[PDB]
Amino acid sequence: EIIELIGNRKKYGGSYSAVSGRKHIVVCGHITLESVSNFLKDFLHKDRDDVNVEIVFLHNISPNLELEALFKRHFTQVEFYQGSVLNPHDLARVKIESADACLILANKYCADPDAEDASNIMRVISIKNYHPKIRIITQMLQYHNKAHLLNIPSWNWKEG
Amino acid sequence: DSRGQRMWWAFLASSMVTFFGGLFIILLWRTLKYLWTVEVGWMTSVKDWAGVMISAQTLTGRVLVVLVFALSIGALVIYFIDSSNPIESCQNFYKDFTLQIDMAFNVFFLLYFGLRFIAANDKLWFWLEVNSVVDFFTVPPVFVSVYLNRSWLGLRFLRALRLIQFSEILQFLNILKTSNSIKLVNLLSIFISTWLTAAGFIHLVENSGDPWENFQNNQALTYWECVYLLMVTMSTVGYGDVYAKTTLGRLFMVFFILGGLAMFASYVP
Amino acid sequence: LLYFGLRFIAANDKLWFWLEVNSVVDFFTVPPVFVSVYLNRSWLGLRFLRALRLIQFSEILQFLNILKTSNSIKLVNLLSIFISTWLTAAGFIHLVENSGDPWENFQNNQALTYWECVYLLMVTMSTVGYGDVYAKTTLGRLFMVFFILGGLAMFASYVP
Numbered sequence: 001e002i003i004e005l006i007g008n009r010k011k012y013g014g015s016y017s018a019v020s021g022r023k024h025i026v027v028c029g030h031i032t033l034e035s036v037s038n039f040l041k042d043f044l045h046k047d048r049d050d051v052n053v054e055i056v057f058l059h060n061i062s063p064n065l066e067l068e069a070l071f072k073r074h075f076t077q078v079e080f081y082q083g084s085v086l087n088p089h090d091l092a093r094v095k096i097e098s099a100d101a102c103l104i105l106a107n108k109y110c111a112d113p114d115a116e117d118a119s120n121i122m123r124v125i126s127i128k129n130y131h132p133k134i135r136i137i138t139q140m141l142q143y144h145n146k147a148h149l150l151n152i153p154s155w156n157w158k159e160g
Numbered sequence: 161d162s163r164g165q166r167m168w169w170a171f172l173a174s175s176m177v178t179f180f181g182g183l184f185i186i187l188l189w190r191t192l193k194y195l196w197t198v199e200v201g202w203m204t205s206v207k208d209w210a211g212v213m214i215s216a217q218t219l220t221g222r223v224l225v226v227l228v229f230a231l232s233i234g235a236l237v238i239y240f241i242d243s244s245n246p247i248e249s250c251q252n253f254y255k256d257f258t259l260q261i262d263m264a265f266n267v268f269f270l271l272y273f274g275l276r277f278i279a280a281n282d283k284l285w286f287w288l289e290v291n292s293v294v295d296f297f298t299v300p301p302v303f304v305s306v307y308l309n310r311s312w313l314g315l316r317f318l319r320a321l322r323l324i325q326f327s328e329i330l331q332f333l334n335i336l337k338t339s340n341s342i343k344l345v346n347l348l349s350i351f352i353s354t355w356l357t358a359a360g361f362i363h364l365v366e367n368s369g370d371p372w373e374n375f376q377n378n379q380a381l382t383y384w385e386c387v388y389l390l391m392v393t394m395s396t397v398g399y400g401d402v403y404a405k406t407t408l409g410r411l412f413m414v415f416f417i418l419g420g421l422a423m424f425a426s427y428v429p
Numbered sequence: 430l431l432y433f434g435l436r437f438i439a440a441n442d443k444l445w446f447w448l449e450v451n452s453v454v455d456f457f458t459v460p461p462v463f464v465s466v467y468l469n470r471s472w473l474g475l476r477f478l479r480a481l482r483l484i485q486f487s488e489i490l491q492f493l494n495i496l497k498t499s500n501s502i503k504l505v506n507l508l509s510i511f512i513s514t515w516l517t518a519a520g521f522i523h524l525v526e527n528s529g530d531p532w533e534n535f536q537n538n539q540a541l542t543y544w545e546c547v548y549l550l551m552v553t554m555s556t557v558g559y560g561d562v563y564a565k566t567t568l569g570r571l572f573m574v575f576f577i578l579g580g581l582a583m584f585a586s587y588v589p
């Protein structure tokens with residue numbers, strides 16, 4: 001019991017350090033092995049022009065061994081931090097003030113489409129509440145839920 | 161140098177200077193800038209090049225990591241051979257394959273430590289790391305011994321702590337991809353490394369003696385016998401054929417019984 | 430020997446039949462008897478392997494349509510494996526300890542009986558370790574070191 005009580009610690013706690021002359025983005029939402037692999041494979045393709053933006057994930061569940069191995073494979077251009085996007089402390093930890101954009105992934109194969117949309121709406125509201133000028137890209141499952149995003153005070157579709 | 165006098169303190173002092181003395185440079189630098197406050201730069205390019213080299217993202221990076229795997233075992237094997245020599249002996253650098261091959265290994269481990277230092281984010285928490293600590297306690301004494309024309313079987317048993325990096329460099333090489341294999345390699349590496357390290361510490365303490373007893377408790381033991389003793393202790397079988405008889409050995413055995421027993425009970429099944 | 434030929438003929442893949450426990454024990458037990466009757470002189474070699482033939486008891490009981498339920502099959506499997514490996518390890522210890530070390534001209538031998546070796550291995554496998562009897566040769570100590578890892582787990586998992 002003592003051995004278990006000691007060593008109960010978060011290995012992914014910490015804060016991102018900005019680099020002068022280099023952008024970065026924040027990815028949150030439905031983080032899993034297949035989704036992350038597909039997203040990275042499409043984002044870091046060689047057909048795109050030379051890019052040097054960093055990808056900073058943010059999830060509240062510690063990754064498993066093979067996801068950690070994937071992050072090790074993409075060691076010098078991907079970072080992971082444990083936290084919740086509904087927490088201003090975490091949002092400040094991931095240096096969201098200077099982030100170029102925030103991407104929110106969705107769970108297409110979900111049991112209830114409405115709950116996922118509600119959670120995504122909450123995440124968008126939290127991010128815009130913390131910083132009302134960041135650019136947000138999100139996935140919506142149902143059309144009648146997309147009209148709710150049009151009523152957020154800071155959601156500008158003319159901007160990206 | 162001095163045949164009659166014991167020179168063990170020189171080797172130990174070298175390692176403590178680099179660790180503690182180098183640590184304060186980091187702390188002094190942070191406070192000095194604190195009072196100063198009252199496109200990518202060239203440093204960033206060097207840092208990302210060092211990170212790419214450390215990872216296996218290039219053909220040059222792949223061969224460097226493989227050499228780290230090979231030389232970490234080679235340095236460990238050399239310790240096994242040299243463990244049967246007297247505790248503190250005299251050897252010259254110009255007429256021995258050993259202490260000359262070991263020079264090549266330890267010079268390489270110094271350069272690899274430099275690359276890891278550059279690629280780190282927070283230098284303080286990189287300094288306070290297990291691999292950095294084992295490098296600090298392993299590398300400088302070789303140069304000290306070469307300068308002094310002497311030798312001492314000091315904290316050389318720490319060379320078995322380099323086996324932990326295997327499970328990570330295999331993932332860098334894109335060899336391990338599945339959770340079961342990753343877990344198996346992690347467990348095996350940790351278990352073997354800590355077992356061998358504990359055996360080496362017992363060997364050193366028992367064969368040397370007690371410093372405040374003027375080295376009169378020296379009990380003659382071999383590395384294989386110490387490995388057998390640690391295995392019997394971890395298994396909780398506990399014959400009376402071999403056991404620690406010095407004060408430091410008994411103290412370390414008492415403190416190791418707390419953790420090694422639980423580790424053995426959990427890992428092996 | 431005849432029973433080995435019949436199994437060989439009926440085998441599907443000869444390589445994987447060759448690399449089998451019963452085939453190995455037959456290989457290491459049968460030829461030495463002919464060698465002994467030729468040379469008119471014997472040697473207590475790897476004859477302790479005959480205890481590994483107790484594994485097939487459950488299989489032949491299922492062949493004879495005696496074991497049909499699951500609990501009986503599990504009980505017979507556990508008992509057979511436990512007894513066979515216990516006796517085999519005891520035999521190996523007996524041979525190694527009664528003989529010397531080949532790189533010592535057999536000068537460090539210890540006088541032990543098979544019953545004493547069985548008692549020693551029971552005490553070791555139960556993690557009691559009286560210390561009244563123990564192995565003193567290099568090969569004996571090495572085999573005990575490797576046998577602990579498997580035997581302790583086997584005992585603790587099988588006896589309850």
Ligand SMILES: CC(C)CCC[C@@H](C)[C@H]1CC[C@H]2[C@@H]3CC=C4C[C@@H](OC(=O)CCC(=O)O)CC[C@]4(C)[C@H]3CC[C@]12C
Binds near residue numbers: 371372373374
């Ligand atoms: C983990 C790092 C911080 C290393 C820590 C090592 C110390 C715990 C050891 C290393 C050297 C040891 C010392 C080496 C020799 C001596 C002299 C000895 O006194 C003698 O002159 C010995 C014979 C006598 O008692 O008359 C008393 C113990 C002492 C101070 C030892 C005390 C314990 C020391 C400081």
Ligand SMILES: CC(C)CCC[C@@H](C)[C@H]1CC[C@H]2[C@@H]3CC=C4C[C@@H](OC(=O)CCC(=O)O)CC[C@]4(C)[C@H]3CC[C@]12C
Binds near residue numbers: 372411
């Ligand atoms: C913190 C870890 C890494 C190392 C811990 C080492 C201690 C267990 C050592 C370090 C200093 C040692 C002491 C240094 C000197 C002495 C004096 C020594 O006595 C004498 O020198 C003369 C009187 C006598 O013969 O008892 C008795 C042991 C003692 C207390 C030693 C006991 C063991 C100590 C506390």
Ligand SMILES: CC(C)CCC[C@@H](C)[C@H]1CC[C@H]2[C@@H]3CC=C4C[C@@H](OC(=O)CCC(=O)O)CC[C@]4(C)[C@H]3CC[C@]12C
Binds near residue numbers: 241242243245383
């Ligand atoms: C935990 C598993 C992986 C088994 C671990 C085995 C070790 C306990 C073995 C492997 C290599 C062995 C060493 C290989 C060679 C030597 C040198 C040998 O001495 C000589 O060859 C020179 C003459 C002499 O000093 O006797 C003494 C034993 C020793 C230290 C051996 C001690 C026992 C070692 C460390």
Ligand SMILES: CC(C)CCC[C@@H](C)[C@H]1CC[C@H]2[C@@H]3CC=C4C[C@@H](OC(=O)CCC(=O)O)CC[C@]4(C)[C@H]3CC[C@]12C
Binds near residue numbers: 382537566
């Ligand atoms: C597959 C892995 C586990 C390696 C297997 C081989 C090693 C475990 C062997 C190789 C050389 C052996 C060593 C060769 C000679 C000696 C000296 C021997 O001491 C003696 O002088 C004899 C004492 C006695 O016979 O009782 C103690 C065992 C030891 C260290 C042996 C321990 C076992 C060693 C390290």
Ligand SMILES: CC(C)CCC[C@@H](C)[C@H]1CC[C@H]2[C@@H]3CC=C4C[C@@H](OC(=O)CCC(=O)O)CC[C@]4(C)[C@H]3CC[C@]12C
Binds near residue numbers: 377405406407411
């Ligand atoms: C956990 C940390 C605080 C270390 C705890 C032990 C130490 C504080 C040292 C200080 C003085 C030492 C003692 C100094 C002298 C002796 C007498 C000594 O008596 C003997 O017969 C000597 C045997 C031997 O050491 O070879 C037994 C160990 C003992 C109690 C030592 C045990 C370890 C002690 C208590």
Ligand SMILES: CC(C)CCC[C@@H](C)[C@H]1CC[C@H]2[C@@H]3CC=C4C[C@@H](OC(=O)CCC(=O)O)CC[C@]4(C)[C@H]3CC[C@]12C
Binds near residue numbers: 531532533534
């Ligand atoms: C795969 C299993 C079932 C069987 C494996 C058997 C080997 C482990 C045995 C069989 C023959 C043995 C060898 C037979 C004779 C010798 C010579 C013997 O020479 C000496 O005693 C001289 C020592 C010296 O003066 O240096 C040393 C042991 C050795 C190599 C033995 C080592 C162990 C061997 C290889």
Ligand SMILES: CC(C)CCC[C@@H](C)[C@H]1CC[C@H]2[C@@H]3CC=C4C[C@@H](OC(=O)CCC(=O)O)CC[C@]4(C)[C@H]3CC[C@]12C
Binds near residue numbers: 532533
């Ligand atoms: C991997 C498993 C299945 C078997 C492991 C067997 C080893 C522990 C044996 C096999 C060959 C043995 C070696 C064969 C011959 C010698 C020379 C022999 O030379 C002497 O007799 C000189 C010193 C002395 O008298 O002991 C010393 C032991 C040694 C190294 C033996 C050490 C133990 C070895 C490595």
Ligand SMILES: CC(C)CCC[C@@H](C)[C@H]1CC[C@H]2[C@@H]3CC=C4C[C@@H](OC(=O)CCC(=O)O)CC[C@]4(C)[C@H]3CC[C@]12C
Binds near residue numbers: 542544
């Ligand atoms: C139903 C099953 C479980 C019964 C199994 C019984 C065996 C485990 C016992 C029965 C008689 C025993 C034997 C009785 C006497 C001796 C003589 C003994 O040699 C002595 O000189 C013993 C001296 C002493 O008694 O101290 C060596 C063991 C041996 C062969 C014993 C070996 C173990 C034996 C065969």
Ligand SMILES: CC(C)CCC[C@@H](C)[C@H]1CC[C@H]2[C@@H]3CC=C4C[C@@H](OC(=O)CCC(=O)O)CC[C@]4(C)[C@H]3CC[C@]12C
Binds near residue numbers: 543544545547
């Ligand atoms: C049944 C299991 C679970 C526990 C006991 C297993 C062994 C320890 C027993 C079973 C059969 C016994 C053997 C049965 C018969 C004999 C022959 C017996 O021979 C004599 O009476 C004299 C021999 C001589 O002249 O030295 C000596 C004991 C011995 C080897 C016994 C030794 C102990 C053995 C191997």
Ligand SMILES: Nc1ccc(Oc2c(F)c(F)c(C(F)(F)F)c(F)c2F)c(O)c1
Binds near residue numbers: 247371
């Ligand atoms: N040949 C020799 C010379 C001095 C020795 O003194 C040490 C000591 F007293 C001690 F406490 C430690 C500890 F920090 F690890 F605990 C050591 F490493 C020591 F080296 C020794 O053990 C052996």
Ligand SMILES: Nc1ccc(Oc2c(F)c(F)c(C(F)(F)F)c(F)c2F)c(O)c1
Binds near residue numbers: 524525529531568
């Ligand atoms: N009478 C005698 C003669 C030679 C011996 O040499 C062996 C040996 F060195 C060895 F290592 C093994 C092992 F493979 F099983 F380990 C053996 F089986 C051996 F037979 C021996 O043990 C006893």
Ligand SMILES: [K+]
Binds near residue numbers: 397557559
């Ligand atoms: K005991």
Ligand SMILES: [Mg+2]
Binds near residue numbers: 079
């Ligand atoms: Mg980075």
